[PDB]
Structures are given as structure tokens and as C-alpha cells.
Design a protein around this nucleic acid. Structure first.
Ligand SMILES: Cc1cn([C@H]2C=C[C@@H](COP(=O)(O)OP(=O)(O)OP(=O)(O)O)O2)c(=O)[nH]c1=O
Ligand SMILES: [Mg+2]
Ligand SMILES: [Mg+2]
Lengths: 412, 555
DNA sequence: AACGGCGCCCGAACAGGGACTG
DNA sequence: CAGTCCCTGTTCGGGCGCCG
């Protein structure tokens, strides 16, 4: 009884044609059971090889959850429908969400299955379930309703979502509610007991219309930044000053007021690295001035909503991971550090996966975008293990870099 | 008026703005003429082929090749121009089944559908685009032209349609027989069950009659009832499997196309034969771009070829997969970037073997290449068994712990244990984390001219030691590596080295033990002889330490 | 002399970043 | 600042094996 919203690709682009990657036994068995129930409910339908489009599919389990969730890697289809969920039917981002004391994330993607999808667009939602040892050919489906993981689903459902959330927002005018992908971000300044109580009231508002029982809690007011800090030693050697000047010289690309004149004067000659060098009166003066500039904010740094976010991560060792978010180089909108995450001191890939999910969540709360990641890992290493540790219903863009640490910039 | 087959048709379109094929026929031998007129006549009476007239302004050349191990002929249609104008299909064949992934079954039957593509219909609106003439005489009768009502052999959409059509027909039978395993690869069917021999044949006949309802015939010609079963190029026995006999050519003079076939068979043989190497054989296929050019076998390629033929002498076999037991993968280092592995569940009962000899990167070490082999085995195991095997690796836990905790990139290996089988994988030198007290400090630098390709490399030290070496036909990067090599040559067992080269430092910090660069290999040899080496970096052109002094000497 | 799938080892073409020169 | 170079990386198409 609902007219399908017409959806068209960006002019000059064809649909996604991405190959399905191998899946483990437990993931294939989970997807076969899930897709059977969805096909019985008409959410998906089997298709043939005349559909040249395809999108990878796998399964995940959210944090502290034993239930399999179907996850489609619609990253290719999403950037091929960019003028739809950003230009036509866009969702405004509330600036006050990051200022709230507590923000809870609710999975509402199940509500998208009640709205049919445009018949002319269903061919782009094709996916293929693989088989172990290739016992059978790939089993192909396509979506008949709004699929989870497609950025067009919350855009079309936005009109439906507003009417459902209309009474609750009137009851609580101070609560900020933001919708991104399959998730719903609900922030308030109430106390922990009052907040969780108001979250349950919102759940009942959705029930009177399978992951709604979960509630991942955030605290954006408790989020910290990791500034550039300089060491403080009682004695300084030639090697210590060479490392300090190298760090300050690289930092000059960010803070143009940093000077290294009086510090380079301490290294006059061809001295041994371990030779202790006492800091002169002017060297103490120059080093004290540089420590204050690192406390001052960077000039002309602000968020441009038309530019993409970029995230770089550095492996610091011993469970330490630093990261920077920027749109223009050396114009970081946010820097931070993570420590003692899951897999610390045993698994780099699980930690890196955890860090990517944390950074993406922060970017959704602060700017409403997911950054493109520059991952410090080999492509084949990441593509082998990352799905084993993924616990989110979205997937950000990423690329792979290899930058040896010539100088510890973000973590001495 | 042709009867419509029970198999649902697949709606096939063409790329917009393009028409059908209009290619002239190919003059063929009279032997091919007497082999195709009898086929088009039989397919016309069976409804598989309809006759057309002048209302079909299309044409496509055809030919034929002999069926493998038979007297029958395979009718092919060179649809290379039709494929360019036909819509793209998404392939549903995602891989190749492997016998090591098969479980133990009491009863096994291997079927084979007769006239696979000739039993699945074509799209109604698409049959007009498949036109082809058949001359009865090579230069007399014009020959009546026909069309296709089924799937032609040679079309780029025929495999995808048959594989999808075969699945929809087997879906109702599999729902009625869940405990029966049916490996569906193209038209060949592998049917297994734990039922008794008598009850197994009963369900086989039920399946044969089920497929017959859609016009799929399973003739007794290629019906296999007794082991060993020939399936996917293997010999399937009740409790073991092996590859069909592989014949390696033994020519007195070796060319380029002969080695390409030789390495290919060894790659196919290395899945069950442990220890097959193709490094020195494939090394001969470099640079030479003439398939008909004789290449003499080197002494390393001859000893490698002799060791491969000896492995193929003794017969080997793999076992089948038991889900109640764990998967074990053990890797051995074969030297020169060569790795071999075996996957098993019980000791010395290999499911399959394999090798990893890929050399990625100009500079690497054994620890990186072992990590790459683990990743290759893991993904391969997920395809075949859907899980990751426990690894037995020839690297100490302490060695691996030192590498991954100190590397700047994220790296990881799944659950594994150490196996003490030399040669063990280790790191051949460790850069210090702090400068060395009492060790001479070398400030190295190197400059080169972009035009004349001339350059210098040298160092200055805190004790006054100094050297400058002129270099001809070099680069700035090479002089920076040369400067470090000079410092390592002229220093004691413990040395501090200060450089401004981000290029040189990045190479050495990754602790490589092998390199495509002779200069880097010499640097590695010196680093191994040392007891303590501390590399430090400083920004260039900043008047920092002795780096300013050595910069004047070389530039 | 046809089509599709998977694997390997190969070279050519292309991309991207530090560093030097106009 | 552009425009190069040097160096290293990935991508892709073809050679071969193998299956149908
Ligand atoms: C070997 C081969 C096969 N095919 C396609 C056609 C039918 C299926 C199976 O081929 P087949 O089993 O050898 O021949 P088929 O048509 O089934 O006839 P039968 O010998 O089984 O009776 O794959 C092909 O197009 N080109 C080929 O070279
Ligand atoms: Mg057959
Ligand atoms: Mg230099």
C-alpha cells in the first residue's frame, strides 16, 4: 500500500559487481538460515545469473551478543547512490549530540523491512551465498524491501521515522535523536537511571508500530584528545636533542611558530650520541615557548561539511594506538589514543578492528560522517581476519599504508 | 511449433544500441562437414534446433572438436562477436571442489548429464540472435540455415544458465533427501550417502527419474557404480583419494612452451606431492618472449627437475575430511623464499599439500614470508573446510613475539604452536632501541648528481674518523645506502649510525634478510656480523650534529 | 579456431611519495 | 611552488595447469 520511492544511480555509473569472498562454516550456516526466513517473509527473492550485479555478504555478532546478524557490504552501492541519501533526502546532523552526557545506539534496521523497494532498483541489491568446498554453485538473492546497510534505507524511511518519533520528541524536548544507517543515536543530559528509563520508553514506542533489546551506551563528554607532548628530562644527551629537534621540525608543519634555533645550537660539532648536553639559558627559553605553542590551538581548523573525513592510525606498541582525523593535511579536527582494547598484547588485527570501529562511531556522533581510513597493515593481512572481529552494522572505507616510524610524533 | 521444455527460461537481453552477430562462415575440412550435418538433423527432429529463412539477417561461424576419450564430436559456435554484444552475467561458479573437502560416505555414485547445454532452453526473444548456416557441400549446396532453441556451446552465458538451472531442479530433490550429499559441478553430479548399497541405488534411481521430468538424461555410459571413481580429475577410493596419473614430458631439448607446461603440471601435482619446487624452472621463463625458443636448463633448474621426478615416483594419496577432528597445518622452509606445507588431521595422513614461493617486495625476511604463507593456507582452508587449521610453525614463540610487538604494522598469526624442525625461522639482527655508550658514532650521508649520475658517499665520527668515496653511475638513494655500508665496514662490533635518509632507514628498520639489491644484501651481511647497531634519523639541511659536517663533504 | 571457473608465475602499465632542480 | 627522478607498490592480462 506504499508507493515505492524511485531510486536511480549516479549518472554515468553502473551497479556494483563485487565478488563474494570465502565464508566460514558457521557464517554460511547462519546466512542460509537467515535468508530462508527472509525469503519466506518476502523480504528477499532468489534470482538468476541474468543479474550482472553482486555485493558481498557475511555475518557478524554485536558486542556481548550471541545472535548472528546478516551484514551486506553495500560500500560500493552506497557511493554509487551518493546524490540520493545526501542531496535529495538527506538527514541533518545535530551539533548537540556530541555535547550530551550519555548517548545510546539502538538498532532499528529491522523497521526498514516493512517498506518495499523500487522494482527498477532491486537488481542492484543482489548478493550471493557461497558454499563450503563449492559443493553447490552460489545461491543468489535480491532484496524486495529496504535493505539493511544501504544508505538509501534510512533516507526513504526518514518520513516514516519522523512520524513515529514525533510523540516522543514532544514528550522530551531536550533529548537529541540522530539516525545513521541502521542505527539510532539517542542522547540526553539525564542521569544514568533516568537516561536508561527514557531509552526503554523509546523502545516501547517502536514496539507499538530482533536487536532492539540491545543498547550500546556512549559518553561523548568523556571523550579526550591526545595533544603533541614533549619529553621532560633532567639531563639531555645528543641523541635526546636530535630526536627532539626532529620531532619539533615535523610539528612545524602544524604549528608554524615552533623554532629549533637554540636547540640545534646545542648540537654544534660531531659529538657522540650518548654525550650529555646541558641545556643553555636560551635553549630552556626556546623549549618552554614550544611547549606553550603545543597547548595553543591550530589556526584556521574547522569542519567543512563538503569534504571527506580521513583517519590515520599508528601502532604504538604495548596495546597503544594513536589516531588523527582531518580533512586537510596538518589540519586535524581531532586526535586521540586508545589503550588496552580487546586483543591487547596478543592480536593486532582485533585491536586495529576495534580502533576503526571506535573512530567511526566518534565520527558519526561528531560530524555524521564515516572517515576513510589509512590502515597500518598489509592488505592481505587485513582482508584475511577483519570480518572475524567486526561488530558493527556499517563498514567504512579504508586504504593500506606502510610508514615506518622515523620519529614518535603522537606518542613519545 | 516447438514444444516448450519444463525448464524455466532465463530472460537474456543484449547491450543497448547493438544488434546481433553478422560474421561470415569459416572454410573447414570435409571431415567437419560430414560431422555437423548429422547433428543439426538430429537436433531438428528432437526440437533442440529450428530452421529459419531469409527473415533472420544474422550469421555466426561454427566448427567442432573431438570429445575427450570418445568417438563423438562436440559442436562449437564461435560466439566471440555475440559475447561482446550480449549482456554480462554474474558467474555462480565460485570455485573448484577439492577431494580433501569430501567427507567419508558409505555409498558413492558419480553421474553425468548427457547433452547438458542441449537440454536447457534459450530465451524466446533471444533465439533469433543465434543464426548459423550449415553447407551440405563445401562449394555446391548453399545449405539451409538453422537456429538454437537451447544453450549453444561457445556462448559466454551458457555455463551460468546451466549451473543456475541445474540448481533449481535439484532443490526439490535435496529438500526430500537431506542426508544425501550432492556435489553439483557443471553437469557432473557426485551423490554420496551413508545408506547401504541397496538403498543407495534406490535413491539414485529416484534422482535419475526426478531429473528425467525436466528432460535431463543420465545415461549408463558415464554412470559410475564401483570405485575407484573418476571425479574432477582425481581417483576416489572408499578411504583415500589420489590425483590421476600425471605425465611429465622428458624432451632432450627444452623450449619455452615446454617449460610452461612443465611448471603447470608441477603446480597441479604439488597439491598432494610434498616438496615440489618450481623456482629454478620458472626462473627460465624470464625475459625471453618467444614460445618457440630453445632454453638450456641451468644446473639449478636441472637438480630441481631431478628432485621433482623422484617425488613423483613413489605413489602418494590424500585422505578425507573428518569434522570431528581438528585441522593441522605444518609449514617447512625450503630455502630461497620457498615454503611447503601439509594439511592433515591424523599424523602422516595428509589431506593435501601445497607450496608458497611468492616473492613480494624488493626487501623482506623469512618472518614476513611465513606470515604470508599462513594467510594463504588460512584462506585456502576456509574455501575447502570452512575453518582455520591450527598451525605448526618452525619459528620460536619468542622470535615471533619479538617481531610482531616491535613491527610498526599490524600483523598476526592464528592459534599456532612451535615445531622444532630445522631450518628454523629467526631474525638475523636486532637494531638497538637506545644509543650505545662507548660505541663510535658515525654521521653518514650521500649525494649524487641527477644529470651526470655521479655521486659521493662518506661519514664523519666523533673520534675524527672520516671517509669520502666517489661513486659513478648512482642515485641519491644508492649513495645513502652506500654511506651506511661504509659506516658498517669501518666500525667495530658496536656502532651508532646517524643518517638523514628516510629511504635507507625504512629498509633497514624492517629487518630484511634478503633483497633484490646487492647493496642491501651486503648491508645485511654487515648487520649480522655486528653485536649492537643503533640507527638514528635526523632531518636534513638543519645544521644538526655531524650531519651538517658530512653533508658538506659529499655535496 | 569456442565458453565459464580456480590456481601459479610472468611482464607491462599505472599509481604515489620523498627529494632534487628550474 | 611545478616537474622531473627514483623507488616501490598494486593491478591486469596472458602463459600454463586443471575442471566441465
Ligand atoms: C568439456 C566442455 C564442456 N562444456 C560444457 C557443455 C556441457 C557441459 C558438460 O560437457 P560434457 O559432459 O563433457 O558433454 P555433454 O554435453 O554433457 O555430453 P555427454 O558426454 O555428457 O553425454 O559443459 C563446454 O562448453 N566446453 C567443453 O569443452
Ligand atoms: Mg555430460
Ligand atoms: Mg642525506
Amino acid at each position: 500500500p506504499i508507493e515505492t520511492v524511485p531510486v536511480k544511480l549516479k549518472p554515468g555509473m553502473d551497479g556494483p559487481k563485487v565478488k563474494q569472498w570465502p565464508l566460514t562454516e558457521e557464517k554460511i550456516k547462519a546466512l542460509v538460515e537467515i535468508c530462508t526466513e527472509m525469503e519466506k517473509e518476502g523480504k528477499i527473492s532468489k534470482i538468476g545469473p541474468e543479474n550482472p550485479y553482486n555485493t558481498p555478504v557475511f555475518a557478524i555478532k554485536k558486542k556481548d551478543s550471541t545472535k548472528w546478524r546478516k551484514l551486506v557490504d553495500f560500500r560500493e552501492l552506497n557511493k554509487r547512490t551518493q546524490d540520493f541519501w545526501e542531496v535529495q533526502l538527506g538527514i541533518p546532523h545535530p551539533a548537540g549530540l556530541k555535547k550530551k552526557k550519555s548517548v545510546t545506539v539502538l538498532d532499528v534496521g529491522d523497521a526498514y523491512f516493512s517498506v518495499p523497494l523500487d522494482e527498477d532498483f532491486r537488481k542492484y541489491t543482489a548478493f550471493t551465498i557461497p558454499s563450503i568446498n563449492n559443493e553447490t554453485p552460489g545461491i543468489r538473492y535480491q532484496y524486495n524491501v529496504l535493505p539493511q546497510g544501504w544508505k538509501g534505507s534510512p533516507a526513504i524511511f526518514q518520513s516514516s521515522m519522523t512520524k513515529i518519533l514525533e510523540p516522543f520528541k514532544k514528550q522530551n524536548p531536550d533529548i537529541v535523536i540522530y539516525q545513521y544507517m541502521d542505527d539510532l543515536y539517542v542522547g540526553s543530559d539525564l542521569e544514568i537511571g533516568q537516561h536508561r528509563t527514557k531509552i526503554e520508553e523509546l523502545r516501547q514506542h517502536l514496539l507499538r508500530w530482533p536487536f532492539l533489546w540491545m543498547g550500546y551506551e556512549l559518553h561523548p563528554d568523556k571523550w579526550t584528545v591526545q595533544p603533541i607532548v614533549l619529553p621532560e628530562k633532567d639531563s639531555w644527551t645528543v641523541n635526546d636533542i636530535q630526536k627532539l629537534v626532529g620531532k619539533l621540525n615535523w610539528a612545524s608543519q602544524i604549528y608554524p611558530g615552533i623554532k629549533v634555533r637554540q636547540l640545534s645550537k646545542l648540537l654544534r660539532g660531531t659529538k657522540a650520541l650518548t654525550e650529555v648536553i646541558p641545556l643553555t639559558e636560551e635553549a630552556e627559553l626556546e623549549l618552554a615557548e614550544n611547549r606553550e605553542i603545543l597547548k595553543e590551538p591550530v589556526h584556521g581548523v574547522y569542519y567543512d561539511p563538503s569534504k571527506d573525513l580521513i583517519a590515520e592510525i599508528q601502532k604504538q606498541g604495548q596495546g597503544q594506538w594513536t589516531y588523527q582525523i582531518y580533512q586537510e593535511p596538518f589540519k586535524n579536527l581531532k586526535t586521540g589514543k586508545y589503550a588496552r582494547m580487546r586483543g591487547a598484547h596478543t592480536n593486532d588485527v582485533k585491536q586495529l578492528t576495534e580502533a576503526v570501529q571506535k573512530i567511526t562511531t566518534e565520527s558519526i556522533v561528531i560530524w555524521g560522517k564515516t572517515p576513510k581510513f589509512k590502515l597500518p597493515i598489509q592488505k592481505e593481512t587485513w582482508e584475511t581476519w577483519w570480518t572475524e572481529y567486526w561488530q558493527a552494522t556499517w563498514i567504512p572505507e579504508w586504504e593500506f599504508v606502510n610508514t615506518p616510524p622515523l620519529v614518535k610524533l603522537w606518542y613519545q | 511449433m516447438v514444444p516448450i521444455s519444463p525448464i524455466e527460461t532465463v530472460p537474456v537481453k543484449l547491450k543497448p544500441g547493438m544488434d546481433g552477430p553478422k560474421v561470415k562462415q569459416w572454410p573447414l575440412t570435409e571431415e567437419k562437414i560430414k560431422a555437423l550435418v548429422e547433428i543439426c538433423t538430429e537436433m531438428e527432429k528432437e526440437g533442440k534446433i529450428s530452421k529459419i529463412g531469409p527473415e533472420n539477417p544474422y550469421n555466426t561461424p561454427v566448427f567442432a572438436c573431438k570429445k575427450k576419450d570418445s568417438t563423438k564430436w562436440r559442436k562449437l559456435v564461435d560466439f566471440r562477436e555475440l559475447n561482446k554484444r550480449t549482456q554480462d552475467f554474474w558467474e555462480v561458479q565460485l570455485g573448484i571442489p577439492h577431494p580433501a573437502g569430501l567427507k567419508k560416505k558409505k555409498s558413492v555414485t558419480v553421474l553425468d548429464v548427457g547433452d547438458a547445454y542441449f537440454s536447457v532452453p534459450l530465451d524466446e526473444d533471444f533465439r533469433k540472435y543465434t543464426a548459423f548456416t550449415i553447407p551440405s557441400i563445401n562449394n555446391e549446396t548453399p545449405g539451409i540455415r538453422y537456429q538454437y532453441n537451447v544453450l549453444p556451446q561457445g556462448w559466454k552465458g551458457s555455463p551460468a544458465i546451466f549451473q543456475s538451472s541445474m540448481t533449481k531442479i535439484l532443490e526439490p530433490f535435496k529438500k526430500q533427501n537431506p542426508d544425501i550429499v550432492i556435489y553439483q559441478y557443471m553437469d557432473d553430479l557426485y551423490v554420496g550417502s551413508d545408506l547401504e548399497i541397496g538403498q543407495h541405488r534406490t535413491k539414485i534411481e529416484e534422482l535419475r527419474q526426478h531429473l528425467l521430468r525436466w528432460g535431463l538424461t543420465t545415461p549408463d555410459k558415464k554412470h559410475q557404480k564401483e570405485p575407484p571413481f573418476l571425479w574432477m580429475g582425481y581417483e576416489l577410493h572408499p578411504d583415500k583419494w589420489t590425483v590421476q596419473p600425471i605425465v611429465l614430458p622428458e624432451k632432450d631439448s627444452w623450449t619455452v612452451n615446454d617449460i610452461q607446461k612443465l611448471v603447470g603440471k608441477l603446480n597441479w601435482a604439488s597439491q598432494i606431492y610434498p616438496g615440489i619446487k618450481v623456482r629454478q624452472l620458472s626462473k627460465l621463463l624470464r625475459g625471453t618472449k618467444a614460445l618457440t625458443e630453445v632454453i638450456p636448463l641451468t644446473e639449478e633448474a636441472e637438480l630441481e627437475l631431478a628432485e621433482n621426478r623422484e617425488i613423483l615416483k613413489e605413489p602418494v594419496h590424500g585422505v578425507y575430511y573428518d569434522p570431528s577432528k581438528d585441522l593441522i597445518a605444518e609449514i617447512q622452509k625450503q630455502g630461497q623464499g620457498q615454503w611447503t606445507y601439509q594439511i592433515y588431521q591424523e599424523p602422516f595422513k595428509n589431506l593435501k599439500t601445497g607450496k608458497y614461493a611468492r616473492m613480494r617486495g624488493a626487501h623482506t625476511n623469512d618472518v614476513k614470508q611465513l606470515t604470508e604463507a599462513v594467510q594463504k593456507i588460512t584462506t585456502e582452508s576456509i574455501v575447502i573446510w570452512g575453518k582455520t587449521p591450527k598451525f605448526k610453525l618452525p619459528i620460536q614463540k619468542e622470535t615471533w613475539e619479538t617481531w610482531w610487538t616491535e613491527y610498526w604494522q599490524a600483523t598476526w598469526i592464528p592459534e599456532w604452536e612451535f615445531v622444532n624442525t630445522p631450518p628454523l625461522v629467526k631474525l638475523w639482527y636486532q637494531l638497538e632501541k637506545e644509543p650505545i655508550v662507548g660505541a663510535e658514532t658515525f654521521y653518514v650521508d650521500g649525494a649524487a648528481n641527477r644529470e651526470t649520475k655521479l655521486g659521493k658517499a662518506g661519514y664523519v665520527t666523533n673520534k675524527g674518523r672520516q671517509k669520502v668515496v666517489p661513486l659513478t653511475n648512482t642515485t641519491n638513494q644508492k649513495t645513502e645506502l652506500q654511506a651506511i655500508y661504509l659506516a658498517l665496514q669501518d666500525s667495530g662490533l658496536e656502532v651508532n649510525i646517524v643518517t638523514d635518509s628516510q629511504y635507507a632507514l625504512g629498509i633497514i628498520q624492517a629487518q630484511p634478510d634478503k633483497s633484490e639489491s646487492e647493496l642491501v644484501n651486503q648491508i645485511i651481511e654487515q648487520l649480522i656480523k655486528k653485536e649492537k647497531v643503533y640507527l638514528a634519523w635526523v632531518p636534513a639541511h638543519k645544521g644538526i650534529g655531524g650531519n651538517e659536517q658530512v653533508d658538506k663533504l659529499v655535496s
